[PDB]
Structure 1
Amino acid sequence: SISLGLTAASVAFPPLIIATGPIAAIGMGASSIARNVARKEERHTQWLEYKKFLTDGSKHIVVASPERGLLDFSGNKVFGKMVLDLRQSPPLLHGESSFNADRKIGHRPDLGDWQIREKVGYANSISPYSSLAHGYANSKWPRTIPKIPSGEYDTIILGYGHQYQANTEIEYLSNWIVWREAVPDSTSRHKRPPLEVLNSQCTVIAGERKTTVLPLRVLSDLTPECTEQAISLKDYKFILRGGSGGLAVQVGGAGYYDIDANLVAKENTLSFRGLPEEFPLTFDLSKQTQSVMLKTPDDEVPVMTITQKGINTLVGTAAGKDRLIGNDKDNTFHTSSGGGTVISGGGNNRYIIPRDLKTPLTLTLSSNSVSHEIFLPETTLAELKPVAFELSLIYWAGNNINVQPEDEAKLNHFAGNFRVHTRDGMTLEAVSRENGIQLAISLCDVQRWQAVYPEENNRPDAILDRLHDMGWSLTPEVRFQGGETQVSYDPLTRQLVYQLQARYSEFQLAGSRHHTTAVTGTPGSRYIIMKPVTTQILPTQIILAGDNDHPETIDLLEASPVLVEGKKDKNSVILTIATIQYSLQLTISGIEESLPETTRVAIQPQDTRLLGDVLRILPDNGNWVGIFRSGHTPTVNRLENLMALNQVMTFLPRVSGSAEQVLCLENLGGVRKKVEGELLSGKLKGAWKAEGEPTVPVNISDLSIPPYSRLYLIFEGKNNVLLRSKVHAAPLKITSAGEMQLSERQWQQQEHIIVKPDNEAPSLILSEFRRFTISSDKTFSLKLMCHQGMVRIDRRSLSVRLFYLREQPGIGSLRLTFRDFFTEVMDTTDREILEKELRPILIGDTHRFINAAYKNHLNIQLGDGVLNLADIVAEYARIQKEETAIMTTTVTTDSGELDLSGRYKSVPMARKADTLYHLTPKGDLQIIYQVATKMVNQAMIVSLPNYRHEWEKYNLSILSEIPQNNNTVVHSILRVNGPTMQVRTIDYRGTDENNPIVSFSDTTFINGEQMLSYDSHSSGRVYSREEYMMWELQQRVSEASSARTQDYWLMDAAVRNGEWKITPELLRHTPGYIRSTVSKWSRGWLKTGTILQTPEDRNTDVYLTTIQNNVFSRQGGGYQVYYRIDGMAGADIADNAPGETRCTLRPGTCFEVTSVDERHYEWNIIYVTLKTCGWSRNGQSKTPNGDNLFN
C-alpha cells in the first residue's frame, strides 16, 4: 500500500523527449561528513562517523533489475575506476575499493588482526580479541566486488564514485583498557587528511544492443547548492564507448565526458534534457571537443567538457534559448521550446520543434545541406498562416519558425527538399512556383486527421476544401495516403481518381464545387450521393466496371431528387440532377467502351431503375429529356402489395429529420379493393391527389383503391408507425340469367363471386377448374369439406369455399355464395330441434324447401367437377344428426403428459407420408391427418381453437406413427411455433436402435393461405440442425418469404395487449438474429465446438425481426456475418418504440459455435449460429486481425 504511492500511470506516445535520470541529493560527498566530524569530540567517534559514511557508500554499489533491463550505480560512492563490460552475458564489473591505511605499514589486506597487531605493535600478545581494533589497516569498504546477475541490460545509471584512502591511527582508550581506530590528531606534525581522494573515473563499454546511459543529474536547478555541487564534480571523468546498436547518453550536468559511439549505429543521441530548463546552451557537433559553460556570479565555469565522436542526434535543453550547430552528416535536432538558433550542417537534417515557442526559432540551412524534414508533433495545420513565397513557418498566435538559407540567392535550391510534417497528418512540401518557392500540401494521412478532428467526418473532398479555403496551395502531386482507399490528385486538371483496393467496398460519393471527381468501378461497389450544399458545382464522372456478376449501384437517396434529365454522347451518358434549389452533373462512361446495363440506379428508395431501362427510354440524339421530376408522384417510401390477403401489419421506420413518410398501397389487379384498416400507432394526413392541393382526410376504417391504381398515405415521422389492415377484393356480382362462361384467367385476380338471380339463376361455369381434394373419393372429400364447418349458412344464404391449384406455388381461393336458397321455414337453422324436424323432409322431398328459381340449377358445373348441392344438404343434415366413422380430437391448454418443452399429445392411429395443415380465418388450428387404412375411409383432425390468438401460451406438441410398405415403424414428432410447423421424423428401430437418422421439416403459411401441403418428395438426404438453421439464415439474407411471414407474425403477436409489452413467455420461442460487420478472416478459421465471448461493452443489441426492421441489409464496408441464437431468454428489453424489438444481451455471456458456414464467402456474407453456453467465462472476442465483433 505504501509502495503504491511511488508508482506512476503509463503515458502513451510522448510527443517530446523528456528527462528520465535520477536527481542527485544535496551534499552526497565527503564534505558533509567532514563538517560533522569537525566537531571536536573523541577521535574514535569521528572515525566511527567516517566509517559509517564509507559503509553506506559501499552498501548499495549496484542495484540490478534484469526483468526491466536496468542497472543502478547511483548508490556507488566508494568504488572508483569502475569499469562495466556489457559484452559478456553476465556483465563484468571491475574497479578499485576504498581501503583502510596506516602511517607505517600502509594497507595490508593479506594479514589478520593478530598479524597486523604484531606488525604495528599496539598491544600485548595476551590481549583479548575484543580489545583489538578490528579491521585496522586491512579493511576494504566495497568488501567484495559485487556480482551482477545475468541478464540483458539496456539502461545503465552511473553514479559519481571515488576511491578513498581512509587514513587512521591507533588510540588507547585507557578507561576501557582497549585499543580503537581513530582519526589522526591534526595538532601533531603535518598530518595526512582522514579521507584522501585517489581517483574520480568511471567507464562503461556498451555491448551490441541499444544502451542508454543516465549519469546522476547533479545540475538540475540553478540553486546555489546544486551549482556548487556541480562545480565540485566538474572534473569527474566518464568514459562511454557505444556499440553497433547505438548509444544514448543523457548528460548528468557536470564532468568530463568522452563519448565514442560506433559509426555503424543509425542513431547516437546526446540529450541535454537533464540540465536546468532555462539554460543557455551552445553546442557544435562539428567540434571534437567542447565545453558547456555555466554563468556563475561574475564569470563562467566549464561545468562540462564533452569530447564526442559519432553523435548525430543532438537533443537540446528543455526550454532554454540554445544554439545547436550540426555537422556534415545526417542529423536530428530535438530543439527546445525556448526558441534559439539551429544552424544545420550538410546532409539530411530532421527537426522536432514543440508548440508555444517563447522566442522565434531561427533555422539556418548551410549551403551543403541537401534535404530537411521539420516535424511539428504538437502543432496542427490550423495554426500556420499561409505566407507566400517564403519558407518560414508562421504561426497565427505565438512565435514562429524563421527558416533562412546561409545564402538567400540559393533559396531556390530547396525544390522538393523541404518537408514539414504536422500532427493532423498533413505533410507540406516546399514546391517551386513560377518565380520562387511556396509551401504546398503534398500528403494527407486520414488517420491522424480523424484523430485530431473526430467531429469532422473523414471526407477527402471536405479536407481538400478546407485546404483550399485556408489559403494553402496544392502540389500538382497529391497523395491521399491512409484508409482503405487511395485518391490520386491532379489539381491542374482538377482531377480526383479513386483507387479502390478491396472488393464489394461501399464508398460514398460527394461532388465538389471546384474539383471534378472520377469514380473507379469495382465489383460489388455501391455509392451514395447526398444533398448538394453549394452553388456552381463542378460535375461528377464514373468509369463503370460492369462484370455482370457483382454489379455496381449508384444511389441518389440522400440527394433529394427533384429535377432529373439525361443525354448521350461518345458512348457515355451525361445526367443532370437538381434539388429544390441546387444542381449537380454526372457523367457515366464505361471502361469496356460499352454500357453495363447492370448498374441499377436507386434514385428513390423504392423507385430503383436499371441503367438498361433508362438507356432504352433516353433518346439517342444529344438533347435533354426530363426523366424525373418532383411534380410527379411524391417520394415512394413504403410499397404495399394489395393482393396479399388478411392481416399484413404494415410497418416503416421512423425518421425524425424528414418527419414525412409515404405508404403506397398498390393494386395490380382488375378488381377494386377496400382496405378495412385499423390504426394502432401513428396518424394520417389523408390521401394525396394533386401536387398543389390539400389532402382530403380519409377514414382509416375504410380506404378505396380502384383497379390498377395507387393509394398514397402521408404519415408523420415523429413517432414509429404500425398499422394493421385486412384487405379483401370486391366480389363480382352476377345477377342475370342464361348461360355464362368464364375461364381461370379472367377471375384468378378475383377472390369472391356472388350470385343474386332475379328470375332465373345463371349457369355458372369455371373453365380450367382444378379441384383440390386430398383423395379422389367424392363422398370422402364431401365429408372433409363439410366436417370442419367450412360450409357456412347465413339465414337463407349458403357460402362454400373452394380451392384451385395453378402454376404458381401455393393455392388460390374462391367462394360461392347464393342468397335466398333456403326457404322461409329453413331460416331457423340455429334451432337444432327445427333442423332435426326438417331433416326427414330434406331426405324425402327436398323440393318442399327448395326455391323454385333455383330448382333448375341444383347442380353447378365447376369445370371438371360437378357440385350437387342436394348432396351437400343431405351430408350436412347427416353430420348434424350424428353430432347430436370420423371423430374429433380436441385439446386444451392444460392437457398433456410429460428443446421439445411443454405438453405431449398423440393420435392413436397412424397417418400417411404427406401432410396437410388448415388454418381457419377466425384463428383456429385444424391439423389434418390421414389413416392409410382403406377398410373405412376416415381421417383425423387435430383441433386447437383460438390458436392464432393464443399460441404464446400454447406449448403442446403432437406425436404420430408412420407405417411403410416394408412394415417400417417411423415416429413423427411435431411442434407448433406460429408459422413454423417443426416436424421431426425418426426411423427409430430402423436399421439400428437409439441411433436414429433424425430428419427435419417445416411448413410456413405464406400470403395467408388456409391450406398448406408437404409431400416430402426428396428433402435432400438428411435434414440436420445445420441444414435447418443455416437454411433459414440463407433465406433471410436473401429476404425470402417464409422468414418474412414468421417475422410479420411475431411482430403482430407482440401487440396482443396493444402496447410494446413482450412477455418472457414468448422470448423462449423466439430465436435471436443478429447482423454484424467484420473486416476479414482466413478461410475456415472458426469451427464447430469453439466458443465466442461477447466483448466488454455495455450491451450488445439483438433484433428478433430483420425483414421489416431493415437490419440485415448490406451496409458499411467489409464482410457481413449473420448470427443465429436458439435461446436468448434472459436478456432485458430496451427502450423501444412499439413495433421495433431490440433486446440487450449482458456482457460476459458465452456462446457455443455450431456449424459455421462459409459457402458465400465470395459474396462476403457468412452465416454463423451460436448456442447459449453459460458463465464458463472462456472464449475469444476479436478476429485474429484484432477487429471487434458485434458492432
Structure 2
Amino acid sequence: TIILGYGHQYQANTEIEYLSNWIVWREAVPDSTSRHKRPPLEVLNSQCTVIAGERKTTVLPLRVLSDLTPECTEQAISLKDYKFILRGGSGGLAVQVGGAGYYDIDANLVAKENTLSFRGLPEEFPLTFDLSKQTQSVMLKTPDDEVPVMTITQKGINTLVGTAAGKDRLIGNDKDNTFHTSSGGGTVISGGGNNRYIIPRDLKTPLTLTLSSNSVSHEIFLPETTLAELKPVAFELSLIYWAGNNINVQPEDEAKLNHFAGNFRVHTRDGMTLEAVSRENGIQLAISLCDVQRWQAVYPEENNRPDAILDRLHDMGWSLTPEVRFQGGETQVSYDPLTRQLVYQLQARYSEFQLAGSRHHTTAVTGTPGSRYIIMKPVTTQILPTQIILAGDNDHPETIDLLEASPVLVEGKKDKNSVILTIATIQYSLQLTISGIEESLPETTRVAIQPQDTRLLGDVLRILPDNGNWVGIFRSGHTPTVNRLENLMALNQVMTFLPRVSGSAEQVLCLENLGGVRKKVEGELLSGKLKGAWKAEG
C-alpha cells in the first residue's frame, strides 16, 4: 500500500538583510517594491512516479476532492495538472484516484486484475468513464463552467469501480471486465468477453445494463439482495425488485436475446443462482443452484431441507432448471423437475441419513458403506415411491431402519434383483424400493422392523416368492413389541433396567427360555409397575 502526496520542488529566492540594530546579517525575502523580483517561493516540478514490484500494490493518493465544498473544489482545481506515473507489476495494480491530477497508469497485461476505483470522489458525483478509451478526462461541474479536474491515461485496466452513490455511465472494454457499480443507478455498457457485475441494494435510479453484441457471458452479483425481493417476471432478463428501483437489463439488439441462454448467471446473497435458460418461446430466469449454507445463514428459523426449499421456491412462482444442484450440506442433492425425481448422493461413511418421501417427487438415496437410512413416518396420503441404493462391501453392511416409521403392516415383493417393500401405518402407507449397485442385494444389510426384531436382508430375500406376489412380513398383532429380550441363560441378579419412554407409555419385557426344563424366575421389582402378563392376541 502506497499513500501519495502532492509534493513540488521549490526554489526559495532570498536576499541578505543588514540588521544594523543587532549588527548582524540575516537571510530575508526579496523586496517586492524594488521593481519586480522573483517570488519568494517558486514551483519547479509537479510530478510523482511509482514503479510497482512483483506483488499486488495499492496506490492511494491524498484525497483532495472529497466533497463539493468550495474550498475543496478550489484545491482540486489548483492541483489539476499534477502528474502521477504509476507502473504496475505482475501481481496487479489497484489505483484509487485522489480526485485531481494527470494519472498515467501503466498496468501489466499479465496481471489477473487491475483496478481503477473512483470511490474517493464525492459520494453523489456524476461519473462517466469508458474503458475502451486510452485517454479520458473527468469533468467537474463548477458554477457556470466545466473544468477537467482529472485526466486519466490507462492501459490494462479491467476492474472499474464506480463512485459511492452517483449516477454513473460506465462503458467496458472488449476484454473481461468487473463492474463495482455505485448505489445511484445510471447506465452500464459492457463490451466483449466475460463481464462480472456487483450491484448494491437500494438503487436511487434504475440501473440499465446494455449487452454488447461481442459479449459472451455475464455474471451478476447481488451481495446485499436476497431472492425474496425479486419479482419473478417471465420472458425478461431484467431483475425487478419487489420494493425499490430495479435493474433494467436490455441487449444491444433484441433479436439476439436468446444468445444469453446459460451465459447469464445471477447470484444472490441468500444462495440462489438464477440462470437464463431458453424456454419454448423466449428466455426465462429459473433457479439453478442453492447454496444451503447461505440459505441457513439468511433463514435459520425455517426448516432446511431440499424438499422444503423446493416447495417454498415453487410457492413464489419460480421456474426450475432441468438440473437443480443443492451444494453444501452433508449430501449433494440434485433435482430433475421434468421427471420429478430427487437424488441424494451420500458421501461419508457410517452416516445417519433420514429418508422421507413427499407428494411431489420420488426420493432416491445412493448410499455408502456403513451408512444407516432411517425411514421417516408417513404423514400424508399419496406419498410417491422411494428408493434406496445399497453399497455393499460385506464388511461394513448398511442398516435400513423402520423403527421411527411406526409400521403396522409391512409387505415385500421381488423383481429384477430389487426388493420392493410397502410400509403402512395405522392410516397411511409408503412404498420403498431397496436395490443394489451391482445388480445383487447385499445379504448382510440389516432391516430393523422392531427394536428387538432385526432381520438380515439375506434372510428376508428367502421367504419372498420370485413372482411379484406380496407376502406378509410383519403385523402389529401376534406377540407385542418387545423392548428387551432377556434370556433366562443369565443366572442370578441381572438388574434388568428398562428406561422410561414418554411417547409410547408402554414397556414390554420378554423372558425367554430355550432350555428343556421348566424355569422359575424369582423376581423382585424395585421401581415401576407391571400390568400383568400378556396372554393372547386380542
Q: Say whether the fold is shared (TM-score over 0.5).
A: yes
Residue matched to 1:622? 468
- The alpha-carbon deviation at position 386 of structure 1 amounts to 2.2
SS at structure 2 position matched to 1:681? coil
- The alpha-carbon deviation at position 686 of structure 1 amounts to 6.2
Q: Taking structure 1 as reference, are residues 503 and 265 closer, same or farther at Cα in structure 2, changes over 3 Å only? A: same
* Counterparts of 1:424 and 1:677, CA distance in 2: 62
1:830-909 equivalence runs, <5 A? none
Contact between 1:425 and 1:449, CA under 8 Å: does it hold in 2? yes
Contact between 1:567 and 1:623, CA under 8 Å: does it hold in 2? yes
* Counterparts of 2:136 and 2:432, CA distance in 1: 68
Contact between 1:285 and 1:327, CA under 8 Å: does it hold in 2? yes
Structure 1: 5+ residue stretches without partners: 1-154, 689-1190
TM-score, structure 2 length as denominator? 0.91
Contact between 1:269 and 1:313, CA under 8 Å: does it hold in 2? yes
Deviates more, 1:316-325 or 1:617-626: 617-626
Q: Taking structure 1 as reference, are residues 179 and 503 closer, same or farther at Cα in structure 2, changes over 3 Å only? A: same
Q: Taking structure 1 as reference, are residues 216 and 635 closer, same or farther at Cα in structure 2, changes over 3 Å only? A: farther
- The alpha-carbon deviation at position 283 of structure 1 amounts to 1.3
- The alpha-carbon deviation at position 431 of structure 1 amounts to 0.9
Contact between 1:510 and 1:529, CA under 8 Å: does it hold in 2? yes
* Counterparts of 1:518 and 1:594, CA distance in 2: 18
- The alpha-carbon deviation at position 504 of structure 1 amounts to 3.8
Q: Taking structure 1 as reference, are residues 454 and 188 closer, same or farther at Cα in structure 2, changes over 3 Å only? A: same
Contact between 1:160 and 1:236, CA under 8 Å: does it hold in 2? yes
* Counterparts of 1:497 and 1:269, CA distance in 2: 43
- The alpha-carbon deviation at position 642 of structure 1 amounts to 4.1
* Counterparts of 2:523 and 2:376, CA distance in 1: 36
- The alpha-carbon deviation at position 375 of structure 1 amounts to 1.4
Contact between 1:234 and 1:302, CA under 8 Å: does it hold in 2? yes
TM-score, structure 1 length as denominator? 0.43
More helix by share: 1
Contact between 1:383 and 1:395, CA under 8 Å: does it hold in 2? yes
Quick check: which has more Rg, 1 or 2?
A: 1
Q: Taking structure 1 as reference, are residues 341 and 447 closer, same or farther at Cα in structure 2, changes over 3 Å only? A: same
- The alpha-carbon deviation at position 288 of structure 1 amounts to 1.6
Q: Taking structure 1 as reference, are residues 360 and 660 closer, same or farther at Cα in structure 2, changes over 3 Å only? A: farther
SS at structure 2 position matched to 1:309? coil
Deviates more, 1:570-579 or 1:256-265: 570-579
* Counterparts of 2:65 and 2:154, CA distance in 1: 20
- The alpha-carbon deviation at position 685 of structure 1 amounts to 6.2
Contact between 2:56 and 2:92, CA under 8 Å: does it hold in 1? yes
* Counterparts of 1:322 and 1:683, CA distance in 2: 80
Contact between 1:509 and 1:528, CA under 8 Å: does it hold in 2? yes
Q: Taking structure 1 as reference, are residues 397 and 593 closer, same or farther at Cα in structure 2, changes over 3 Å only? A: same
Q: Taking structure 1 as reference, are residues 554 and 254 closer, same or farther at Cα in structure 2, changes over 3 Å only? A: same
- The alpha-carbon deviation at position 369 of structure 1 amounts to 0.7
- The alpha-carbon deviation at position 662 of structure 1 amounts to 4.5
* Counterparts of 2:257 and 2:303, CA distance in 1: 38
- The alpha-carbon deviation at position 663 of structure 1 amounts to 4.2
Q: Taking structure 1 as reference, are residues 661 and 311 closer, same or farther at Cα in structure 2, changes over 3 Å only? A: farther
Q: Taking structure 1 as reference, are residues 225 and 650 closer, same or farther at Cα in structure 2, changes over 3 Å only? A: farther
Residues 1:417 and 2:263 are matched in the alignment: yes
Deviates more, 1:433-442 or 1:518-527: 518-527
Q: Taking structure 1 as reference, are residues 342 and 188 closer, same or farther at Cα in structure 2, changes over 3 Å only? A: same
- The alpha-carbon deviation at position 177 of structure 1 amounts to 1.4
- The alpha-carbon deviation at position 546 of structure 1 amounts to 3.1
Residues 1055-1099 of structure 1 show CA distances to partners (whole Å, capped at 9, x for unaligned) of: xxxxxxxxxxxxxxxxxxxxxxxxxxxxxxxxxxxxxxxxxxxxx
* Counterparts of 2:138 and 2:311, CA distance in 1: 50
Residue matched to 1:648? 494
* Counterparts of 1:184 and 1:175, CA distance in 2: 20
Contact between 1:461 and 1:510, CA under 8 Å: does it hold in 2? no
* Counterparts of 2:357 and 2:339, CA distance in 1: 16
* Counterparts of 1:652 and 1:235, CA distance in 2: 90
Residue matched to 1:296? 142
- The alpha-carbon deviation at position 671 of structure 1 amounts to 6.3
* Counterparts of 1:282 and 1:397, CA distance in 2: 28
Residues 611-658 of structure 1 show CA distances to partners (whole Å, capped at 9, x for unaligned) of: 233333334442334433334555433333344333222334555565
SS at structure 2 position matched to 1:294? strand
SS at structure 2 position matched to 1:465? helix
Residues 1010-1053 of structure 1 show CA distances to partners (whole Å, capped at 9, x for unaligned) of: xxxxxxxxxxxxxxxxxxxxxxxxxxxxxxxxxxxxxxxxxxxx
Contact between 1:565 and 1:624, CA under 8 Å: does it hold in 2? yes
* Counterparts of 2:476 and 2:64, CA distance in 1: 81
Q: Taking structure 1 as reference, are residues 533 and 424 closer, same or farther at Cα in structure 2, changes over 3 Å only? A: farther
- The alpha-carbon deviation at position 342 of structure 1 amounts to 1.2
* Counterparts of 1:317 and 1:253, CA distance in 2: 11
Q: Taking structure 1 as reference, are residues 179 and 664 closer, same or farther at Cα in structure 2, changes over 3 Å only? A: farther
* Counterparts of 1:385 and 1:683, CA distance in 2: 62
- The alpha-carbon deviation at position 561 of structure 1 amounts to 1.7
- The alpha-carbon deviation at position 270 of structure 1 amounts to 0.3
Q: Taking structure 1 as reference, are residues 221 and 642 closer, same or farther at Cα in structure 2, changes over 3 Å only? A: farther
Q: Taking structure 1 as reference, are residues 452 and 214 closer, same or farther at Cα in structure 2, changes over 3 Å only? A: same
* Counterparts of 2:385 and 2:330, CA distance in 1: 25
SS at structure 1 position matched to 2:397? coil
Contact between 2:412 and 2:421, CA under 8 Å: does it hold in 1? yes
Contact between 2:346 and 2:365, CA under 8 Å: does it hold in 1? no
Contact between 1:520 and 1:544, CA under 8 Å: does it hold in 2? yes
* Counterparts of 1:521 and 1:380, CA distance in 2: 34
- The alpha-carbon deviation at position 268 of structure 1 amounts to 0.7
Q: Taking structure 1 as reference, are residues 366 and 182 closer, same or farther at Cα in structure 2, changes over 3 Å only? A: same
Q: Which has the higher contact order (CA 8 A, sep 6+)?
A: 2
Give me the identity figure in percent: 100
- The alpha-carbon deviation at position 183 of structure 1 amounts to 2.2
Contact between 1:347 and 1:369, CA under 8 Å: does it hold in 2? yes
Residues 207-243 of structure 1 show CA distances to partners (whole Å, capped at 9, x for unaligned) of: 2221111111112222332222222212211111112
Contact between 1:392 and 1:404, CA under 8 Å: does it hold in 2? yes
Contact between 2:345 and 2:367, CA under 8 Å: does it hold in 1? no
* Counterparts of 1:634 and 1:394, CA distance in 2: 61
Residues 1:536 and 2:536 are matched in the alignment: no
Q: Taking structure 1 as reference, are residues 679 and 420 closer, same or farther at Cα in structure 2, changes over 3 Å only? A: farther
Contact between 1:390 and 1:437, CA under 8 Å: does it hold in 2? yes
- The alpha-carbon deviation at position 351 of structure 1 amounts to 0.8
Q: Taking structure 1 as reference, are residues 674 and 451 closer, same or farther at Cα in structure 2, changes over 3 Å only? A: farther
Residue matched to 1:250? 96
Q: Taking structure 1 as reference, are residues 254 and 675 closer, same or farther at Cα in structure 2, changes over 3 Å only? A: farther
- The alpha-carbon deviation at position 311 of structure 1 amounts to 0.6
Q: Taking structure 1 as reference, are residues 471 and 584 closer, same or farther at Cα in structure 2, changes over 3 Å only? A: farther
SS at structure 1 position matched to 2:297? helix
* Counterparts of 1:216 and 1:658, CA distance in 2: 74
* Counterparts of 1:306 and 1:559, CA distance in 2: 71
* Counterparts of 1:203 and 1:162, CA distance in 2: 13
Residues 306-346 of structure 1 show CA distances to partners (whole Å, capped at 9, x for unaligned) of: 11111110011112221111111110011112222211111
* Counterparts of 1:660 and 1:404, CA distance in 2: 68
Residues 360-385 of structure 1 show CA distances to partners (whole Å, capped at 9, x for unaligned) of: 22211111111001112232333323
- The alpha-carbon deviation at position 681 of structure 1 amounts to 5.1
Q: Taking structure 1 as reference, are residues 413 and 671 closer, same or farther at Cα in structure 2, changes over 3 Å only? A: same
* Counterparts of 1:214 and 1:658, CA distance in 2: 70
Contact between 2:193 and 2:214, CA under 8 Å: does it hold in 1? yes
- The alpha-carbon deviation at position 532 of structure 1 amounts to 3.1
Q: Taking structure 1 as reference, are residues 347 and 176 closer, same or farther at Cα in structure 2, changes over 3 Å only? A: same
* Counterparts of 1:483 and 1:617, CA distance in 2: 39
Structure 2: 5+ residue stretches without partners: none
* Counterparts of 2:206 and 2:295, CA distance in 1: 27
More strand by share: 2
* Counterparts of 2:175 and 2:374, CA distance in 1: 52
The partner residue of 2:363 within 507, 517, 528 is: 517
* Counterparts of 1:340 and 1:655, CA distance in 2: 65
Q: Taking structure 1 as reference, are residues 677 and 380 closer, same or farther at Cα in structure 2, changes over 3 Å only? A: farther
* Counterparts of 1:361 and 1:533, CA distance in 2: 48
* Counterparts of 1:164 and 1:654, CA distance in 2: 92
- The alpha-carbon deviation at position 477 of structure 1 amounts to 2.7
* Counterparts of 1:685 and 1:396, CA distance in 2: 63
- The alpha-carbon deviation at position 473 of structure 1 amounts to 2.0
* Counterparts of 1:464 and 1:558, CA distance in 2: 25
Residues 936-960 of structure 1 show CA distances to partners (whole Å, capped at 9, x for unaligned) of: xxxxxxxxxxxxxxxxxxxxxxxxx
Q: State the Cα RMSD in Å.
A: 3.3
Q: Taking structure 1 as reference, are residues 533 and 290 closer, same or farther at Cα in structure 2, changes over 3 Å only? A: farther
SS at structure 1 position matched to 2:289? strand
- The alpha-carbon deviation at position 456 of structure 1 amounts to 4.9
